[PDB]
């Protein structure tokens, strides 16, 4: 008897997948859905890229020696590194991380002089912790001392209008001396106040002199503070010592992204999702590599693998 | 002896997903069926296009590996992120489970549709054997097998003869 | 000449989703079938009731358009919100995709159920033509066509005659 | 041969939708799932509604001139506007946004006198920045000066118990004068402290006098601070100048919602999901209008449109 | 008189999910079918194993019942948590809805598969009555009913006789 | 005619469930998916458990009388209670909740002496608010007074290196006296500063003396502050009064979890998801008991019940 049979294909090596109803049912074919594959490099093709290396991001605004190349840097992609430091003379920024988040998407910075000038004080405060050709200081700032040791410090006001169309990033410092003796040697006796107001912003600052742990030969510290000054607004600085004054305001250039990483740049490969270990190049919807990956990324998931079937049940 | 999909698959069907095995005096033969194959492939390819999408939303660092943020806000961020990871992990698992069930069923359904199509073009000239084949109650040479495959088989041509052999 | 669902739909079927087209000496005619139509409509209406739900949870401003909140917390809020938007966007897309597949399949299935019902009430008195119709091997006047539609057709009444014309 | 065919309906103009398997398969009918339609008005039917206009929300507690109508306002729905200002004499609230979030869901406020009285000082501090019929001040507060210019300022303590059953909102101010000369003209020489303790709360305040940018004729600023005082608890205010004292405590009335918007109220239409551009009236589960919409809302999504099929495949 | 699944279920079928009711001279009888029953049970058990999973992720307090955290961060936490609750509530609802539809359909499908299996082993020796039964056109004693149930019924043995009674 | 029918089972009294398409379709069987069942006890089997009762968590670091048993406690599960208090002499921690979150997952604490010694001052500051056998103080701290009433307070520096491999938790206090008269009776005249620097951390502190509400007989307050001191780093404390000094640093032991609850421990039952009302023992994926439940938990959902079908349609 003549007959015709209908059938479908099959193979000996089925791939196991999961369904609503069964774990490890075999299908003819399947494809991975969770990315595990990583390129151990920063794929920068098509993007202006700044590798800050020794230079801390916030340092680009104040300008310790490590950051000299980057005082007006310009970028699409910004890479911070572990060894980066924001300082030379010991100290830290208040609200540091917010400010980092601003600079990471800033496109870089452009610097304008604020035009302060000074009478009856010194301006060349310096220290062995910030060294270029011997003792020096933060490039974008001026360490104002009294005119001579112990001498009194003229009370002063200085202001600056932001005449541009974007907001201006303003930064200053409070010097906290290793002793009260050093505070007087530098700014003279009396207590010391520093007051800073725009219109949008009012705040105030007293130095806390006192012994601390010696960091880079230094027992003193510099508190850095900052604000955004709106277009046409003015910032005014009233003070009588312990003031580290800005020489230049900063302005944000455009748009960028910043990452933190421990691997080389590679301008020959292209990418859009990054993490500390490299770049994730992948069309898969999900990934199991790093939950803190940034850019335009597959969604991070707990599972190593989720196979998606791309053929029928295998019945061999 | 020859069998169909109700028993098992054909490790030897290599140029298609779905096919025909026939048995007549000229011998035995296997051919793939293009449309049903391509219909299943198109449908799967549809899923792939849907699930290979690349998100257009950008995310930035909220956190810092080198210098840890304040603890309170860091814990809140970590809890928010962990909760989100739960959600995506559950979604991913479900999606794949659900789609795989659907892929399996879809493929069965396409085999089903081909078999019930053939059954109908054979009309009263054949019977279901129960393994996925038809016993044809007349002589069907290689050309007659080809006419069933390309859907040109005219059942009336073979009817009076077939009707008789099954009674 | 007349054809059914296996070929295509009926742009002229206007008072139902599913229906019957018949051909006899008295002529040609089309009637909608109420139960199968209403069954598909009820089912779709079920989905609508499920997906038109209005949320009862209230949310308030966490953010400010006129006077921006501090940057750190504002970025955390923005990241949290964006992540949530991803989730809802993915869910919405999936839901609609999934439901549409299901709506399509459900409607096919209802046509299927009607056809296999009719096949069974016709017993041995008709044959499948392969376009979604039955060749009835006896005279079926307008009343006999109506009895098939309202499920009162008694196959034994027409059997001896029909069985014969198939031979 | 007599025959009966089974079929289904179809139309020429199918609507395209997406499925698990196919983009743009045509169906007989479909309905939108993502709301894009907006009523360019605040639909307030059934709700007591306060449009603060010129008055800043936080201003209702302190009472600059713009807020005179609203010192004891009462509402279900509260609308803030862009032009709203919380102040007359320049200054800002510390923790401002938290306090806004409290007032937005407060139902409004009811004001009780705290019953402070004063000896050997003045009480009628005033300024051209806060004007009613000529120079005046914040309605709910008292600007305490020294008796006579340069005069010394008696050190003082004043307290207030919350004898109600709900917590009381307490507010006070620190005056930061445009110079040290103005600070002495007002409160006399010497340094100046202001200390504020309930039991639940301890904190402290020094004024920072100094030049700032002139904001509506004023170089000075008023820092406003606040706390919640628990039932039966007492707040006590110790101070010797630069203190802007509360005359009245506030109490929250019930429940409300607040929005920020740029469009008219309309009491004739009803609604429950709002945003800056109007009200979203819709039974759809999703919307693509504004991610910051508030009330009881469809979920915000990225896509303009997601059609849901409401009929079968179209095969014409 | 007796009826099958097209009409309704059998409150009296107690030792299985699916079964057979027969009528012959020796009387009436009901037996459960093990494989189709166990297949549906295995499949449902599969779902249970998938949805009874216990999460491995740990979460800690971010908030405090005894001493309330600062308002701003407390509101942000409350909004984050509420948004997450919306998500899980929607997911839970959808999952159950979707799985129930699938459980129902799966069970139908298993009944379907059993009926179309039987239809095929009976070949030309029986006809569909339309309630889910077969009229067998020959005498089928208790042993013959048992051979259909355990899939050993040989249709050729009863053919010539059955074919004849259908004419 | 002999016949064979195919069928499926059914019951009177189906269970109603929901599907994509229908509300309340009956099935043969179904099972709950949302947990509502609660064990009104803390199931601690297999876990070292500390019930702090009267003792506030932060109090374990400073050591008011209530916390004497717990100064070096050790645990897997830590239970806080409503009546717990961190203090004896009134006051609070700055950044309190962050510190709680640290201690809850700490495994407990181990205490090392910081080895401060003192010359020309007193060390036995005490108060009736902290009583053991009569007047006493925080066990882990030393209330440093001047050598005699009104007497001057030698300016001092004291430091401590963390020579362990984990970070050390350091805590100190600022005493805010009920008046200026009491501040002087205790530490003498003059203003008073306290400065605290590691390397990683710089901050400063002035006392605010002044009248406050009397809290357990006391008008004064103690501000507690803290930091993490990194391995090998030093913390240094410069100060001239109003300083409540640490005697001992703390170190975290291992891992734990902490809960807040109002019900008994039970070592005989086992569990992993907790809330204020008890423990939730359940394999269900979801729960409708408490949204703030912690541990390894089913996901909290809004709905009381979602039945999942575990049999076919019921057609009786
Ligand atoms: C088993 O399944 C895999 C995955 O579905 C099959 O491989 C896939 O085959 C398609 C067919 O073209 C590939 O498409 C390609 O897309 C890229 C996207 O940019 C394009 O550049 C290529 O020109 C092409 O159009 C698809 O990417 C490929 N995927 C993978 C991961 O290999 C495979 O063929 C199947 N195996 C069998 C035996 O059927
Ligand atoms: C194509 O599909 C749409 C949407 O499914 C159909 O319109 C809908 O028809 C239903 C059936 O009556 C309407 O129900 C009504 O709801 C309102 C609102 O509460 C109620 O007041 C009415 O009494 C009634 O119950 C539904 O609102 C309506 N939806 C929309 C968006 O128009 C439409 O008729 C379909 N077209 C064809 C040709 O079938
Ligand atoms: C209707 O449905 C319920 C729920 O699906 C059925 O009860 C369930 O039956 C299974 C089968 O044994 C139980 O498995 C058990 O697991 C535990 C613990 O892992 C083990 O110790 C037991 O010995 C057994 O293997 C399952 O737990 C059980 N679930 C519940 C909530 O009771 C029920 O039997 C069905 N009823 C009818 C009338 O069919
Ligand atoms: C800002 O600019 C406008 C004109 O450009 C001027 O009238 C206004 O007074 C300016 N304000 C200040 C504070 O300079
Ligand atoms: C946040 O997460 C990372 C791992 O994701 C961990 O190393 C870090 O310590 C966490 N932060 C806190 C504050 O627990
Ligand atoms: C937060 O989001 C809005 C748009 O969603 C944007 O205009 C705003 O500046 C964002 N804020 C920050 C701090 O990035
Ligand atoms: C609060 O007031 C009540 C009077 O109702 C009084 O008995 C009690 O002493 C007060 N609270 C305290 C802690 O003294
Ligand atoms: C957060 O939620 C709880 C209940 O979920 C409520 O009692 C509490 O007051 C809310 N917190 C704030 C800061 O509004």
Coordinates of C-alpha atoms in Angstrom, one line a residue, chain A residues 54-192:
Chain A
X54 CA 46.6 61.0 38.1
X55 CA 44.2 63.9 38.0
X56 CA 41.0 63.8 40.2
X57 CA 37.9 65.1 38.4
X58 CA 37.2 67.9 40.9
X59 CA 40.9 68.8 40.7
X60 CA 40.2 70.1 37.2
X61 CA 38.4 73.1 38.7
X62 CA 41.0 73.9 41.3
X63 CA 44.1 72.9 39.5
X64 CA 46.6 71.0 41.6
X65 CA 49.7 70.0 39.5
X66 CA 48.4 66.6 38.4
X67 CA 45.5 68.4 36.7
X68 CA 47.5 71.1 34.7
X69 CA 46.7 69.5 31.3
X70 CA 43.0 69.3 32.1
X71 CA 42.2 72.9 33.3
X72 CA 40.1 73.5 30.2
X73 CA 39.5 70.0 29.0
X74 CA 36.9 69.1 26.5
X75 CA 35.4 65.6 26.0
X76 CA 32.5 63.3 25.1
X77 CA 33.7 60.5 27.3
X78 CA 35.5 61.2 30.7
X79 CA 37.4 58.5 32.5
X80 CA 38.3 58.7 36.1
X81 CA 40.9 56.4 37.6
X82 CA 41.6 55.0 41.1
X83 CA 44.8 56.8 41.6
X84 CA 43.2 60.2 40.7
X85 CA 43.5 62.9 43.5
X86 CA 41.6 66.2 43.6
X87 CA 44.2 67.8 45.9
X88 CA 47.8 68.6 46.6
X89 CA 47.5 70.4 50.0
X90 CA 45.2 68.1 52.0
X91 CA 41.5 68.7 52.0
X92 CA 38.2 67.8 50.5
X93 CA 35.2 69.2 48.7
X94 CA 31.9 69.6 50.5
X95 CA 29.1 68.1 48.4
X96 CA 31.8 66.4 46.4
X97 CA 29.8 63.7 44.7
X98 CA 27.1 65.9 43.4
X99 CA 29.8 68.1 41.9
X100 CA 31.4 65.0 40.3
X101 CA 28.1 64.1 38.8
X102 CA 27.8 67.6 37.3
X103 CA 31.3 67.5 35.8
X104 CA 30.9 64.0 34.4
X105 CA 28.1 65.1 32.0
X106 CA 29.5 68.6 31.5
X107 CA 31.4 68.0 28.2
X108 CA 34.4 69.6 30.0
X109 CA 35.0 73.1 31.2
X110 CA 36.0 76.5 29.9
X111 CA 37.6 79.0 32.4
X112 CA 37.0 82.7 32.7
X113 CA 39.0 85.1 35.0
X114 CA 36.8 86.6 37.8
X115 CA 39.2 89.7 37.9
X116 CA 39.9 90.1 41.6
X117 CA 42.7 92.4 42.6
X118 CA 44.1 93.0 46.0
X119 CA 45.6 95.7 48.3
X120 CA 47.8 95.4 51.5
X121 CA 47.9 91.7 51.6
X122 CA 50.0 88.9 50.0
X123 CA 48.8 86.6 47.3
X124 CA 51.6 84.0 47.0
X125 CA 50.7 81.6 49.6
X126 CA 52.5 78.4 48.8
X127 CA 53.4 75.0 50.1
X128 CA 55.7 72.0 49.4
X129 CA 52.7 69.8 49.0
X130 CA 51.8 71.5 45.7
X131 CA 55.0 71.5 43.7
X132 CA 55.8 72.5 40.2
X133 CA 59.3 74.0 40.1
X134 CA 59.5 73.9 43.9
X135 CA 56.8 75.3 46.2
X136 CA 53.6 76.4 44.6
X137 CA 49.8 76.2 44.9
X138 CA 46.4 75.4 43.3
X139 CA 46.6 77.0 39.9
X140 CA 43.1 78.4 39.8
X141 CA 43.2 79.8 43.3
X142 CA 45.0 82.3 45.3
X143 CA 46.1 81.7 48.9
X144 CA 45.8 85.2 50.5
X145 CA 48.0 85.8 53.5
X146 CA 48.3 88.9 55.6
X147 CA 50.9 91.4 54.4
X148 CA 53.5 90.2 56.9
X149 CA 53.7 87.4 59.7
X150 CA 51.2 88.0 62.5
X151 CA 50.0 91.1 60.7
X152 CA 46.4 92.0 60.6
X153 CA 44.2 91.1 57.7
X154 CA 42.2 93.9 56.1
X155 CA 38.5 93.0 56.0
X156 CA 37.5 92.8 52.3
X157 CA 34.6 92.3 50.0
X158 CA 34.9 91.1 46.3
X159 CA 32.2 90.2 43.8
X160 CA 31.7 88.8 40.4
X161 CA 28.8 88.9 37.9
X162 CA 28.1 86.0 35.6
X163 CA 27.6 87.9 32.3
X164 CA 27.4 84.7 30.3
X165 CA 24.1 82.9 29.4
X166 CA 24.8 79.7 31.2
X167 CA 25.3 79.2 35.0
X168 CA 28.9 79.7 36.3
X169 CA 30.6 77.2 38.6
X170 CA 32.3 79.0 41.5
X171 CA 34.7 77.5 44.0
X172 CA 36.5 78.7 47.0
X173 CA 38.3 77.4 50.1
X174 CA 38.5 77.7 53.8
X175 CA 41.9 77.2 55.3
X176 CA 42.0 75.3 58.6
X177 CA 45.4 75.8 60.1
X178 CA 47.3 73.1 62.0
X179 CA 47.3 75.4 65.1
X180 CA 46.0 78.8 66.3
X181 CA 49.6 79.9 66.2
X182 CA 49.8 79.2 62.5
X183 CA 46.5 80.9 61.9
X184 CA 47.8 84.1 63.4
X185 CA 51.2 83.9 61.7
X186 CA 49.2 83.8 58.4
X187 CA 46.1 86.0 58.9
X188 CA 46.8 87.6 62.3
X189 CA 44.9 87.4 65.6
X190 CA 41.2 87.9 66.1
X191 CA 38.5 85.4 65.0
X192 CA 37.9 85.0 61.3

